[PDB]
């Protein structure tokens, strides 16, 4: 039952795909990876086909490939990107060297919806509701996104939103000090290297995004790392007594004392003219102490989302086994685990 493949050169690289996928055309010119839009002849809809780069070149690439495929295969929710198909032109493990992932093709990211202009309060309710719905699901699998931002949120014409990650999926706290494209949406504990991050690092990002949808402007547009933190602390204040008691290190404490003491601002005096329920939710999302920050499930029940909330249609995920992340395997083992996950893929209902 193996489909017939065809080969073409696109953006100076070979693409070998099933005949199912017609009219391939490169998109994003880098911001997405090596991604083509295509017409799915089985469904009559457009799709996105991502070709992974050098997937089994090394142990690190192989484990990255395996990770992405595992995560995409897991995600089965309306507000999270899903896997429509995964394929390889290889006929056997021995010749397995390329992997293609197929998803829905979205219409625009959230920057392209906002365009430096305020959204209506009802539109903000709907967008944030959907982000939180997706995040309840992600977090229920014990997955943290860690890089939520407008470019990682895509919508269609009907304003249906999906959470994606156009970067490298991070899986541990230890990666937060590596590469990052923008830090405007990053929680202060990450910026301060406090470690022990919880899932509400993602809620911080949502708060930043929500503010920006409401005002049309970035909430914390720092020029650099230090400036990012200074802007954050001007809004949310210097740490309180309760939070200082949780800092293990004299220097971080001695550091945290070395920045100028800011009192927290009343957000009602910052988001002038906003819906008071929006301001209250923002207060609950942008708490400096992450132990006190609202969770996705809690936020879905906030009165701000009354017109959309349905406690019986905010589902959770099956458990996701991430024990592989702790393993040290050979390159051919990661490759074989990946192959087996390609073979076992079951498409979603048509
Ligand atoms: N980095 C990773 O490992 C993650 C792992 C999953 C992750 C999901 C969120 C929770 C955490 C885990 N991979 C992806 O998110 C991923 C995204 C897209 C595609 C192919 N489609 C597209 O590239 C695509 C689809 N519409 N437009 C689009 C079109 C126009 C405007 C905006 C977007 C695309 N560019 C494959 C994988």
From Swiss-Prot:
SUPFAM superfamilies, sorted: Protein kinase-like (PK-like)
Localization per Swiss-Prot or TrEMBL: Cytoplasm; Nucleus
Residues reported in the UniProt entry to bind ATP: 27-35, 50
A Pfam family of this chain: Pkinase
Signal peptide bounds: none
Post-translational modification: Dually phosphorylated on Thr-177 and Tyr-179 by the MAP2Ks MAP2K3/MKK3, MAP2K4/MKK4 and MAP2K6/MKK6 in response to inflammatory cytokines, environmental stress or growth factors, which activates the enzyme. Dual phosphorylation can also be mediated by TAB1-mediated autophosphorylation. TCR engagement in T-cells also leads to Tyr-320 phosphorylation by ZAP70. Dephosphorylated and inactivated by DUPS1, DUSP10 and DUSP16. PPM1D also mediates dephosphorylation and inactivation of MAPK14.
Active site residues according to the UniProt entry: 165 (proton acceptor)
Keyword Transcription: yes
GO BP terms in the entry: angiogenesis; apoptotic process; bone development; cartilage condensation; cell morphogenesis; cell surface receptor protein serine/threonine kinase signaling pathway; cellular response to ionizing radiation; cellular response to lipopolysaccharide
Modified positions (N6-acetyllysine) in chain numbering: 50, 149
Database matches in PANTHER family: MITOGEN-ACTIVATED PROTEIN KINASE
Subunit structure: Component of a signaling complex containing at least AKAP13, PKN1, MAPK14, ZAK and MAP2K3. Within this complex, AKAP13 interacts directly with PKN1, which in turn recruits MAPK14, MAP2K3 and ZAK. Binds to a kinase interaction motif within the protein tyrosine phosphatase, PTPRR. This interaction retains MAPK14 in the cytoplasm and prevents nuclear accumulation. Interacts with SPAG9 and GADD45A. Interacts with CDC25B, CDC25C, DUSP1, DUSP10, DUSP16, NP60, SUPT20H and TAB1. Interacts with casein kinase II subunits CSNK2A1 and CSNK2B. Interacts with PPM1D.
Protein known as: Mitogen-activated protein kinase 14
Gene name, Swiss-Prot/TrEMBL: Mapk14
């Amino acid at each position: 039952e193996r489909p017939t493949f065809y080969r073409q050169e696109l953006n100076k690289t070979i693409w070998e795909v099933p005949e199912r996928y017609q009219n391939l055309s490169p998109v994003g010119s880098g911001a997405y990876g090596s991604v083509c839009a295509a017409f799915d002849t089985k469904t009559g809809h457009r799709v996105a086909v991502k070709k992974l780069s050098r997937p089994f070149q090394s142990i690190i690439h192989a484990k990255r490939t395996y990770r992405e495929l595992r995560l995409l295969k897991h995600m089965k929710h309306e507000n999270v990107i899903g896997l429509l198909d995964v394929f390889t032109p290889a006929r056997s493990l021995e010749e397995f060297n390329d992997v293609y992932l197929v998803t829905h093709l979205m219409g625009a990211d959230l920057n392209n919806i906002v365009k430096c202009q305020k959204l209506t309060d009802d539109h903000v309710q709907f967008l944030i509701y959907q982000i939180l719905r997706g995040l309840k699901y992600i977090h229920s699998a014990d997955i943290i996104h860690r890089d939520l931002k407008p470019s990682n949120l895509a919508v269609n014409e009907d304003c249906e939103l999906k959470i994606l990650d156009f970067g490298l999926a991070r899986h541990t706290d230890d990666e937060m000090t590596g590469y990052v494209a923008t830090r405007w949406y990053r929680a202060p504990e990450i910026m301060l290297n406090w470690m022990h991050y919880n899932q509400t690092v993602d809620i911080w990002s949502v708060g930043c995004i929500m503010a920006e949808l409401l005002t049309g402007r970035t909430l914390f547009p720092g020029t650099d790392h230090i400036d990012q933190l200074k802007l954050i602390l001007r809004l949310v204040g210097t740490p309180g007594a309760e939070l200082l008691k949780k800092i293990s290190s004299e220097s971080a404490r001695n550091y945290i004392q070395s920045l100028a003491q800011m009192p927290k601002m009343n957000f009602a005096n910052v988001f002038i003219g906003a819906n008071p329920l929006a301001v209250d939710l923002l207060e609950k999302m942008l708490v400096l102490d992450s132990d006190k920050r609202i969770t996705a499930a809690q936020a879905l029940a906030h009165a701000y989302f009354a017109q959309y909330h349905d406690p019986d249609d905010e589902p959770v995920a099956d458990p996701y086994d991430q024990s592989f992340e702790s393993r040290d395997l050979l390159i051919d083992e990661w490759k074989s685990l990946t192959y087996d996950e390609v073979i076992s893929f079951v498409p979603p209902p048509l």
